[PDB]
Amino acid sequence: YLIYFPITQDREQLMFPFHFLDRLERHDVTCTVSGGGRSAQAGAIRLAM
Amino acid sequence: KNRAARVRVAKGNKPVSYEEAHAPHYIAHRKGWLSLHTGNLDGEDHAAERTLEDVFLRKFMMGTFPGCLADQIVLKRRANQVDICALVLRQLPAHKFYFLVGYSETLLSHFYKCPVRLHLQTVPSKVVYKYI
Amino acid sequence: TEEDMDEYVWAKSSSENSVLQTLLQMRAAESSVAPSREELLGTKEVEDYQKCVVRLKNEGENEASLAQYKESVKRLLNLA
Amino acid sequence: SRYAPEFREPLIDKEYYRKPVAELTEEEKYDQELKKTQFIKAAAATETSSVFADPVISKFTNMMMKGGNKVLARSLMAQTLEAVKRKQFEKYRAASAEEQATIERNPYRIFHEALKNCEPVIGLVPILKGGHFYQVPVPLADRRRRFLAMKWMITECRENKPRRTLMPEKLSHELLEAFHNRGPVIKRKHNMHKMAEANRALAHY
Amino acid sequence: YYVDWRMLRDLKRRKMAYEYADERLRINSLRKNTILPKDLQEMAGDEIAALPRDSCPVRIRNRCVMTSRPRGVKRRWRLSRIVFRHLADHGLLSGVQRAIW
Amino acid sequence: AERPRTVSRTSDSDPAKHGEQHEGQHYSIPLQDLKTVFPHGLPPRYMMQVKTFGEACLMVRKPALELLGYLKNTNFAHPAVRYLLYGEKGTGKTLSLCHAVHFCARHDWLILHIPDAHLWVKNCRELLQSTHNKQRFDQPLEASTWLKNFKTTNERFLSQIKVQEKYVWNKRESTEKGSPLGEVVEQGLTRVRNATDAVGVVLKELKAQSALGLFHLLVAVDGVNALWGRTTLKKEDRTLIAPEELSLVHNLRKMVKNDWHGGAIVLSLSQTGSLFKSRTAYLPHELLGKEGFNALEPFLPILIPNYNPKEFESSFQYYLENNWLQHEKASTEEGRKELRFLSNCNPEQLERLCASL
Amino acid sequence: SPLSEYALRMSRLSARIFGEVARSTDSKSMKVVSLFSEQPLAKKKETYDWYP
RNA sequence: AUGAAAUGGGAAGAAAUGGGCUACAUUUUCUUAUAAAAGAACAUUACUAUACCCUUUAUGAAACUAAAGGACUAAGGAGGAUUUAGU
Ligand SMILES: Nc1ncnc2c1ncn2[C@@H]1O[C@H](COP(=O)(O)OP(=O)(O)OP(=O)(O)O)[C@@H](O)[C@H]1O
Ligand SMILES: [Mg+2]
Ligand SMILES: [Mg+2]
Ligand SMILES: [Mg+2]
Ligand SMILES: [Mg+2]
Ligand SMILES: [Mg+2]
């Protein structure tokens, strides 16, 4: 995710689900996002997670 | 204001049919298409030629059955077959209709080089959807 | 030529020359009499190095395959 | 808007949801039970539970963005904060133990206290009466007072800087110079207040 | 009778371009290359010019088949925007509806 | 807590002492060794950290410990071994290579350190032709800057080593055989036209004389993937140049060959600054290509990974030990866990995130 | 990159098999192949039978 | 003949005005990647011509058209009253 999402705001968007429930570093996620731009793909993953 | 294909309001005494009552934006919603061919489907050719044949076929049927058409005709193309479905008033004698069918079929089959059939449903009088 | 070939062939390649030249310099430093070409390229150390380079060129290059190549170099070059 | 009026703004406060039930005021307690039967808007792309998210700075970033280039605007603000931290670290190391105590090295605290020092209490709304322009003293809301401070900073740096200087180097030099109540932006606030004093009589109009 | 004299001239232009298509193809091929002597290419440039002007296929204009309108035509049906709209708005075109979205 | 803060520093300033016990501990590089061993070659952002913190401290790590081990057991009689540090962006390849340059520098090796080799294949504003071979070109400014730094690092060895041949710089100026190698360096700086030729003499002299046992030679080239790639320099005909045609690139390609002995070659790959390479390319064959890979084999690839849990905590405490992380929530466990996610333990990303904070 | 002899002789062997242009032909001279491989605009049924 | 057809033309502006386009740069310019990052440029032509002029290619029967280079480069330094659009 650091390689796929070189922008911080995209990574922060993936941090929101786990950080909110204090579950950082406790799960292993495998994503497959097709379509849209960088921000739309991070947002789509956030909801899927 | 939009003036296209809208039979405008009179004073409640104008008898409009179902087809005439509905404006263009009701096509594919409340009323269908009078002609059905495959020439406007995606990746299909000969739209220009199918449309020109339709324009003529409608003018031919009006003149061949003058004053005897209750509503617009429906054209149905399947393979090379053409089928004309017309609502016709019961004004003319029965034997006269057999003449115009034999004539109009043979004439249009030798003009467009396809098998053409005429389907006539006779009504006692024009069917009125509403009075506008 | 080598560029045309789609599947790497270690035999008679830039790798074989580079490997043979290194092994010749290694035996010369040892003060041994100049050895034969077949002798140097028949050793097991050179056998393994052939397999690893071929894997990198044909099978694909990745951290796992590069780790295998690292070990072959250590054996071939007598590195601790 | 694509959100029906029944939708509710999302609440992204991590501590609030995890507080013990008894610690919540009954008004707040009521809203939680009500929201269970309501629709909630999806959270914005820049809305997170991060502990490093500052709303004031996030707003300042959007007021610098041009043409939807958020990456560049955030980069400029990130470079600014670093340029302010690095300017205070140099001063701190090159200062005596007594001076070292006063020196502030937190860029987030220099940014907030800078903006606050540039916020004007009163305003001036220009009016036209009888074919002349009579601007009159006005009172400004908490939203209008904050907007003016941020706008005045982003406009001093954008315009009144040398051609080869960059925004992270002009903005850093102004947040710190404002943080000490001596910058040109502070003068803009002083000029606003001094004009309002002059127009005290024209407030009636 | 065609719609107007402008449609008649175009119809003739379309029938004379069909007659001289092979000729203008064979001759023009001699000019669109760099393999033949420039003396031959300059001469083929004059044989093509000597052909009648109505053989030239760039003088054909697409006109509405029913009203002979030069502009506003849709090439898939060969009708002007005004004529196309009359057939479409009455349900007479198979599958054409108004676009609501 | 500050338990990793004790693990965030080590008292062993000398690179030889370092071992596995010292992993994840930051050793301070002496001030004199910064202005002598490292006048160039340190990353630009790292140099900013050295100026603000007032001290250079390099974390001891397993990749750089493996390299120091091979250098200690070097068999000088055997041909030189090429060590290739390959890793993803920001993983620390340049600073791992600088750790080796400190170890060799303290053992009295002769340092031949090319700080960045991409700078020689792009953005050149003066490109002359070479008298030695008219087909090649000469980069006066690129060579002149390197010589001034090479002089500083090896100033001690510039009087002992002496040229073994005669070099005619101009009709009126030549170098007599036997004169100190410093004279060759002095002429290059004095007359910029010969700068690209003085460099070639220096590289040639050191390579030949090293085998005589007088001195050891560390050829430390960072960004070696530039040599066998493409350039963005154009000839008077506005036609792009090739790497070989350039004189500096041509000479260096010889030094990175294993046809000599008496030293070791330490190479590093960097996609940053690379021309015509993807952003996500880090592997040796992707960056070196078919030409570069064949040139350097057999080489020893040393992967530089991301910070491990021990290394990340030590780096986090080092920033806290210098008061860099000034945000109130940075010291907390929720801040630390956040920075671990956003950075992903990448050394460069962690340095960038903490810079703003 | 340049095309070595093996590459070039293979390319000619392929063109000979697939009925493609075998020689080195300029972009200008490739229009002759287009003119004689495509129906001309005036010979297409849409043009000459545009009108009823 | 106010009808039909063929050939050749249907020109310009020390002018005013509406709309659009580009620029006036540092949140910028050039290059590689890609919008990440890096190396250079950065005031007299640095930013900056979708004009003129000069070449080449494309369509055509016809270049008077379009595109791409080349040089040439002038003005422009964010625009008075006033006015447009956007929840
Ligand atoms: N051993 C280390 N000690 C201290 N900081 C380190 C170390 N390794 C990496 N870092 C941090 O990571 C940053 C990047 O390091 P470095 O430049 O060595 O990486 P790299 O992999 O060579 O990068 P690139 O691919 O861009 O060339 C440094 O500026 C520093 O903040
Ligand atoms: Mg035309
Ligand atoms: Mg590096
Ligand atoms: Mg007339
Ligand atoms: Mg960018
Ligand atoms: Mg032409």
Q: Which of D79, D90, D108 sits opposite F52 (nearest CB)?
A: D90
- Beta carbon of F41 within 6 Å of any ligand 1 atom: no
Chains with at least 3 CB pairs less than 8 angstroms from chain D: A, F
Token pair for residue B71?
């509503």
Put simply, whether D106 touches F (Cβ < 8 Å) is: yes
Closest CA to F67 of C79, C77, C64, C52: C79
β partners of residue F234? F240
Q: What is the DSSP letter of F10?
A: B
Cβ pair D176, D86 in contact under 8 A: no
For residue B127, count other CB atoms closer than 10 A to its CB.
12
Token pair for residue D183?
């910058």
β partners of residue F263? F217
Residues A43 and A36: their CA atoms lie apart, in Å, by 10
Residues C79 and F356: their CA atoms lie apart, in Å, by 44
Put simply, whether B32 touches E (Cβ < 8 Å) is: yes
Q: Establish whether chain G is in contact with chain A, requiring a minimum of 3 CB pairs below 8 angstroms.
A: no
Closest CA to D42 of D9, D6, D5: D9
Closest CA to D80 of D55, D49, D114: D114
F113 three-class SS: strand
Write phi, then psi, for F268 (nearest 5 degrees).
-140, 145
Distance from CA of C57 to the nearest CA of G (A): 20
The crossing angle, in degrees rounded to 10, of helices C63-76 and C14-29 is 30
Residues F209 and F184: their CA atoms lie apart, in Å, by 15
How many CA atoms are closer than 13 Å to the CA of E4, on its beta-carbon side? Answer: 9
Residues F206 and F109: their CA atoms lie apart, in Å, by 12
Question: Which secondary-structure segment (H or E) carries F248?
Answer: helix F247-255
User: Which residues of chain D neighbour A42 with C-beta distances below 8 Å?
Assistant: 45
Residues B73 and B76: their CA atoms lie apart, in Å, by 10
| Amino acid (1-letter code) at residue D192 | M
Cβ pair F57, F90 in contact under 8 A: no
Question: Could you tell me how far CA F84 lies from the centroid of its own chain?
Answer: 12
Residues ≥6 apart with Cβ < 8 Å to F303: C63, C66, C67, F63, F86, F87
- Are residues F349 and A2, on separate chains, in Cβ contact within 8 Å? yes
Q: How many residues does chain G have?
A: 52
β partners of residue B31? B27
Nucleotides of H under 7 A from a protein CB: 3-7, 25-28, 31-43, 57-62, 87
- Chain E span 50-79 residues with beta carbon within 7 Å of strand H: 53-54, 56-59
Cβ pair B5, E90 in contact under 8 A: yes
Centre of ligand 3 from the C-alpha of residue C15, in Å: 28
Closest CA to C73 of F328, E97, B60, F302: F302
Burial class (CB in 10 A: 0-12, 13-18, 19+), F130: middle
- Chain F span 203-242 residues with beta carbon within 7 Å of strand H: 232
Cβ pair B105, B117 in contact under 8 A: yes
Closest CA to F139 of F166, F118, F165: F118
3-state secondary structure chain D: CCCCCCEECCCCCHHHHHCCHHHCCHHHHHHHHHHCCCEECCCCCCCCCCCCCCHHHHHHHHHHCCCCCHHHHHHHHHHHHHHHHHHHHHHHHCCCHHHHHHCCCCHHHHHHHHHHHCCCCEEEEEEEECCEEEEEEEECCHHHHHHHHHHHHHHHHHHCCCCCCCHHHHHHHHHHHHHCCCCHHHHHHHHHHHHHHHCCHHHCC
Distance from CA of G9 to the nearest CA of C (A): 12
Ranges of H-type helices in F125-180: 140-153, 157-160
Residues ≥6 apart with Cβ < 8 Å to F11: none
CA of F125 to C1' of H74 (A): 28
- Are residues D108 and F329, on separate chains, in Cβ contact within 8 Å? no
For A1-49, strand residue ranges (E) read none
C58 three-class SS: helix
Write phi, then psi, for E24 (nearest 5 degrees).
-65, -25
β partners of residue F167? F175
Q: Which nucleotide is nearest to E52 (CA to C1')?
A: H61
Closest CA to B33 of D75, E92, E29: E92
Exposure string for E34-55, b = 16+ CB within 10 A, e = fewer: eeeeeeeeeebeeebeeeeebb
Burial class (CB in 10 A: 0-12, 13-18, 19+), F291: middle
Question: Could you tell me how far CA F293 lies from the centroid of its own chain?
Answer: 19
CA angle F26, F29, F33 (to 5 degrees): 165
CA angle A24, A26, A30 (to 5 degrees): 95
The protein residue with its alpha carbon nearest to ligand 1, atom 8, reads F92
Is the alpha carbon torsion for F275, F278, F280, F283 positive or negative?
Answer: negative
Q: Which nucleotide is nearest to D63 (CA to C1')?
A: H27
CA of F232 to C1' of H31 (A): 7
Cβ pair B123, B87 in contact under 8 A: yes
For residue F90, count other CB atoms closer than 10 A to its CB.
22
The crossing angle, in degrees rounded to 10, of helices F347-356 and F309-321 is 30
CA-to-CA separations, F238 to D104, D179, F233, F235, in angstroms, rounded: 55, 53, 9, 5
Distance from CA of A23 to the nearest CA of D (A): 12
Question: Which secondary-structure segment (H or E) carries F167?
Answer: strand F167-168
Residues F65 and F104: their CA atoms lie apart, in Å, by 13
Residues F156 and F214: their CA atoms lie apart, in Å, by 13
C9 three-class SS: coil
Residues D105 and D119: their CA atoms lie apart, in Å, by 23
Ranges of H-type helices in B1-132: 18-21, 47-64, 94-109
- Beta carbon of F223 within 6 Å of any ligand 1 atom: no
β partners of residue F58? F27
Residues F62 and B101: their CA atoms lie apart, in Å, by 97
Cβ pair A45, A14 in contact under 8 A: yes
F11 three-class SS: coil
Q: Which nucleotide is nearest to F272 (CA to C1')?
A: H38
Cβ pair F263, F78 in contact under 8 A: no
- Are residues C19 and F298, on separate chains, in Cβ contact within 8 Å? yes
Token pair for residue E47?
């044989």
- Are residues F52 and D78, on separate chains, in Cβ contact within 8 Å? no
